[model samples]
Target: SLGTLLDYAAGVIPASQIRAAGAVGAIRYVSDRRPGGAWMLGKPIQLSEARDLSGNGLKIVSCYQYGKGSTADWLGGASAGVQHARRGSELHAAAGGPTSAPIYASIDDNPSYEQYKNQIVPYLRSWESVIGHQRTGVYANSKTIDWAVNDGLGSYFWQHNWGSPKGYTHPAAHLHQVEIDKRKVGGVGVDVNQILKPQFGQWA
Candidate 1:
């Protein structure tokens, strides 16, 4: 039944295929059994000093530390993953995609962007260790050659460009392709890539 729910959200062919692949069972088993029960949480978000996404005390944010233009000031001094006190939660990081940004491009905090990479990245990694989610899978959901070319995590995606052959040429079309391709019965790993474009665009 859990698998059925996952498949329902995953769509007919998508459900049938990944269901057969046993990923569905794995999610169910883990969710039902101990050691890795599932928890409903907010989608990931890019950490920005300009904007705080925390609310309701049950949000799980995913920030990308690295980004274009030598790292912006808004995201500086913050690490990727959910933000918390005493203990932090880090799920996974995505690579090779347009980074998320605060509404304002101007620097507000004025902290060196380098501080995020040095201080923040390690913080997230350490948090992952404490939370027992250290095996964080990172990969690119590449739809276009250029998409992967930027991140090149060596994964495939389908329905990128929204499954439009015309959209395939667009930059993000590559991501669409990787999404669709992963739906294949036994194509490839689906847990890697497409999280850490830095800043945000960050959600899983």
Candidate 2:
């Protein structure tokens, strides 16, 4: 199997456990997955944690996903994108993330083409305006990745399996989610990813 990278936000997995899992690194959160929800306990990584991870010779990357489904962060067009991207950038910097690295803006829900056109595009463009397109990464399903790639929307892409045909992976995806919530490391549920490039937004 290819080298693995863990993606989790329900709870924090210690750096020791991540190393023990024999993984290269992890994809951590920049914005809170739930603003005040109690269940998601492993998000918005702190400075101490980032330092710890890097000190242990592990790579770290940032992601932003504050809401999901009806309350998805990318739903509100340009204003929402500007607001969300600002928050995400602040949190990422606070958590010791590098400005040169990309913050993966998440589109967790599968939306129709119309929604993507009217909402997603402007939303990502706002992120580009706020943080520059060079540091704007996108996380979505395969089909969505295709659309985003065609529009030249993101500097990097993380592909999820939703809304895609079986065994399909977008060619432009830098990180492709292989399994979701399938195993636990350090007692925290995690999704597994395959790194497709030498630099998949790692802040090393």
Candidate 3:
């Protein structure tokens, strides 16, 4: 697996310095909602800045979330994902992200497979209709990965299993979140990540 990191620091360092840390890319949060909206997380990243970083060889990954929604209401989350997809695509193009790069719908909180199928899958499917399946991904755990794969909801999977190895073997786990709390780069806190796949980012 290759190492990487995610961060929300308002400040940034040179891409070469990021590579020096044995990381080749970053996974960042994004939202069309206002800074304090229910869907906002950390200070938002400008698409132009994201494009600049990607041009510098720091591979870029992204995810979206909702601030308030029903876990079992497919239409609710689906509508949100649709809007996210619209804005996310615009951001992707402006940011110079890869055409095939997936924009994950983050489900930080663990939900049962049933919950995922009922709620998250439909939401993702709605996103797929808008952005195509190639651009759809999910950021959750093994359960989410399995659910998405089984139901053919999302194509890319970013796993965050809190250090458990049991679900690491899931076939869809392209990117694994190895560290969840805090790490530092350029004197700023960040979240560490590792990817087992080759096509998604700068992984060797």
Q: Say which prediction, candidate 1 or candidate 2, comes out ahead on TM-score.
A: 2
List candidate 3 segments past 4 Å from native. 7-13, 33-43, 66-75, 162-169, 201-204
Highest lDDT: give the candidate number.
2
lDDT of 2 by residue, 1-204 (tens): 246789888788889899999888899988875656667776788999899889888889899999988889999989999999999999999998989999999999888999999999999999999999999999999888889889999899998888977998787888998999889998889999898988789987
- What is candidate 1's lDDT per residue for 53-128, written digit by digit as tens? 1221111222222232354322333342323211112212221112221110111122333643464344333333
Greater-TM-score candidate between 2 and 3 = 2
Query: All candidates' lDDT scores?
Result: 0.25, 0.89, 0.65
lDDT of 2: 0.89
- Which residue ranges in model 2 land beyond 4 Å of their true spot? 33-36
How far in Å is the alpha carbon of 99 misplaced in model 3? 2.6
List clashing residue pairs in candidate 3: 38-67
Cα displacement (Å) at residue 40, model 3 = 7.8
| Residue 30 C-alpha lDDT in model 2 | 89
